[PDB]
């Protein structure tokens, strides 16, 4: 599924991401825009052999099992395919674990390079929330 901006913001709010660990909703919408262009089916392979999955591009070396990332962990206890669903629940639940891991949203490279320090409230402007 390719979400609209405000549709995703509303879905993320319902799942408890607004101000989760101090990150306002716009941070999460901005991260999804630049990680996946709001597409739940996005995948990208990395040089280390791991793959990033879904709307928040969660990586298989640590967070999910895809059966082809040797010596990887599965800290969210899910198959990586679950992160590609039109229902974002699994992605959100795993993202809450990632953002609690110590580095905050710096775990998402696109957030650090394209959202951090910008006016992220713009990503939710105009939306009925
Ligand atoms: Cl915001
Ligand atoms: Cl933080």
Curated annotation (Swiss-Prot):
Enzyme class at the top of the EC tree: hydrolase
Statement: the UniProt record of this protein carries the keyword Hydrolase: yes
Catalytic reactions on record: Hydrolysis of (1->4)-beta-linkages between N-acetylmuramic acid and N-acetyl-D-glucosamine residues in a peptidoglycan and between N-acetyl-D-glucosamine residues in chitodextrins
Presence of keyword Plastid: no
Annotated GO CC locations: cytoplasm; endoplasmic reticulum; extracellular space
C-type lysozyme domain span: 1-129
Cysteines paired by S-S bonds: 6-127, 30-115, 64-80, 76-94
Location within or outside the cell: Secreted
GO biological process entries: cell wall macromolecule catabolic process; defense response to bacterium; defense response to Gram-negative bacterium; defense response to Gram-positive bacterium; killing of cells of another organism
Superkingdom of the organism of origin: Eukaryota
Gene Ontology terms for molecular function: beta-N-acetylglucosaminidase activity; identical protein binding; lysozyme activity
Active-site residue numbers: 35, 52
Tissue-level expression: In the egg white and polymorphonuclear leukocytes.
Residues that hold substrate according to the record: 101
Listed SMART domains: LYZ1 (SM00263)
Keyword terms of this UniProt record: Allergen, Antimicrobial, Bacteriolytic enzyme, Disulfide bond, Glycosidase, Hydrolase, Secreted, Signal
CDD domains: LYZ_C (cd16897)
PROSITE patterns attached to this UniProt entry: GLYCOSYL_HYDROL_F22_1, GLYCOSYL_HYDROL_F22_2
EC number(s) given by UniProt: 3.2.1.17
SUPFAM superfamilies: Lysozyme-like
Anything else known: Lysozyme C is capable of both hydrolysis and transglycosylation; it also shows a slight esterase activity. It acts rapidly on both peptide-substituted and unsubstituted peptidoglycan, and slowly on chitin oligosaccharides.
Function as written in the Swiss-Prot or TrEMBL entry: Lysozymes have primarily a bacteriolytic function; those in tissues and body fluids are associated with the monocyte-macrophage system and enhance the activity of immunoagents. Has bacteriolytic activity against M.luteus.
Subunit field text: Monomer.
Family statement: Belongs to the glycosyl hydrolase 22 family.
Protein name: Lysozyme C
Species of provenance: Gallus gallus (Chicken)
Gene designation: LYZ
